[PDB]
Amino acid sequence: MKKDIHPKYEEITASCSCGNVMKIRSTVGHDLNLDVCSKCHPFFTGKQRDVATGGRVDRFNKRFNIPGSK
Template sequence: MKNDIHPKTFESTIRCACGFEIQAKSTKGNLVEVEICSNCHPYFTGKQRFVDTAGRIDRFRKKYAKFDKGE
């Protein structure tokens, strides 16, 4: 087997934007920050919630607002 071909692993803290933290092994570094996790994702929680990335919902509403007014 070849020596020294595997990346370095860290005991890292994975931190979500909702505040949830978990300890895991990672090759990314000591601190990994994510926007959404299984603690707050609608699929795992069963609650309907819109995850607005880069204002997609606002752009959609702005684009189709004229159809609601009957124009």
């Protein structure tokens, strides 16, 4: 709903029947939530997927640091 790391959420867009309509739409992202820190205990968090990777890319732990200074 804000994705703890690489924060994202409900952007708005519109629809397109190609024929007629431009009804507004609305996005979101991805819910989901895992993580378990091998430096203490399994802290978890709700993050997007493309948000999980990134952390799991070269953070995973090297990233909690930003939430420190939330």
